[PDB]
Ligand binder design. Structure first.
Ligand SMILES: Oc1ccc(/N=C/c2c(O)ccc3ccccc23)cc1
Length: 293
């Protein structure tokens, strides 16, 4: 009521987003409404902690408003998300130096969050936001841990499994920072090829798409995998794909970085910090995108 809804930005992870102007300050912000027993107070404290997260590559959380017994998050507003940008770039593709710059910044954001013991758990093109100056920022960090993990969005919309790490699909109870690196790996592949890497339409389809590409994991590549809660010995055994087939025509530095982000074993999977030192980034620059707003 102290905001004017300018528009509905979209339908998000834990709820719906709006572009709002604050009549008081005239400042334009993104306003996220979260789903009702009167709310948990655990989530409120944890999310409140996120306000202290400040990094150039993290969308700033401005306020957490608990009032009239509902929860609103107030975020700095950015004009476009990576999903829309990829669709807009689908004819020509995103130039390699911009993909590289975007990946580099995203890993910086992740390195920062992970070093503060904050996980995203939900990464996807919709929650990566871009501006006219060439920056890219991660949004909705730590929301997943605060709350629980739904099989739906808010009300009747289909949750994206495409970016989900295999340890999550296999029913692992404890997430690590590795799940964010996996998601980012999928997004990197998607910027390069202009199609989603693993567009699963169900949980098992998601798993089997990963298996058909990277090979069905076994105890050799992933010690402990056959003991995972949802692991079935009856899984079909697919041979790993020639990797040059996965993301053509990305060069070998990029392919090498991607393979390290996509390791099955969360323990072998590269860290955001280590990834920043990969030779892929030796020539990194910061180009400006062509943005139609
Ligand atoms: O055409 C578009 C216009 C504005 C957009 N902003 C989305 C956004 C934001 O500007 C700030 C924080 C967020 C947090 C979660 C999800 C989206 C956002 C996206 C596409």
């Amino acid at each position: 009521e102290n905001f004017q809804k300018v528009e509905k930005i979209g339908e998000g992870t834990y709820g719906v987003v709006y572009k709002a102007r604050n009549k008081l300050t005239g400042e334009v912000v993104a306003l996220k409404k979260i789903r009702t027993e009167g709310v948990p107070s655990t989530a409120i404290r944890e999310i409140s902690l996120l306000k202290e997260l400040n990094h150039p590559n993290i969308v700033k959380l401005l306020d957490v408003i608990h009032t009239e017994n509902k929860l609103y998050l107030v975020f700095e507003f950015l004009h476009q998300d990576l999903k829309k940008f990829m669709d807009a770039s689908a004819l020509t593709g995103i130039p390699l130096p911009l993909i590289k710059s975007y990946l580099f910044q995203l890993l910086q954001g992740l390195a920062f969050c992970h070093s503060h013991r904050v996980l995203h758990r939900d990464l996807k093109p919709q929650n990566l936001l871009i501006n006219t100056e060439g920056a890219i920022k991660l949004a909705d960090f730590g929301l997943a841990r605060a709350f629980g993990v739904p099989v739906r969005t808010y009300t009747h919309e289909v949750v994206t499994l495409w970016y989900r790490a295999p340890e999550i699909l296999l029913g692992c109870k404890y997430y690590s920072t590795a799940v964010d690196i996996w998601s980012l790996g999928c997004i990197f592949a998607e910027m390069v090829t202009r199609r989603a890497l693993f567009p699963g339409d169900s949980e098992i389809d998601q798993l089997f798409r990963i298996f058909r590409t990277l090979g069905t994991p076994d105890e050799v590549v992933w010690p402990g995998v056959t003991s995972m809660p949802d692991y079935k010995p009856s899984f079909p055994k697919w041979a790993r794909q020639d990797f040059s087939k996965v993301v053509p025509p990305l060069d070998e530095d990029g392919r090498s970085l991607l393979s390290q982000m996509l390791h099955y074993d969360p323990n072998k999977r590269i860290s955001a910090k280590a990834a920043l030192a990969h030779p892929f980034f030796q020539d990194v620059t910061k180009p400006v995108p062509h943005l139609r707003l």
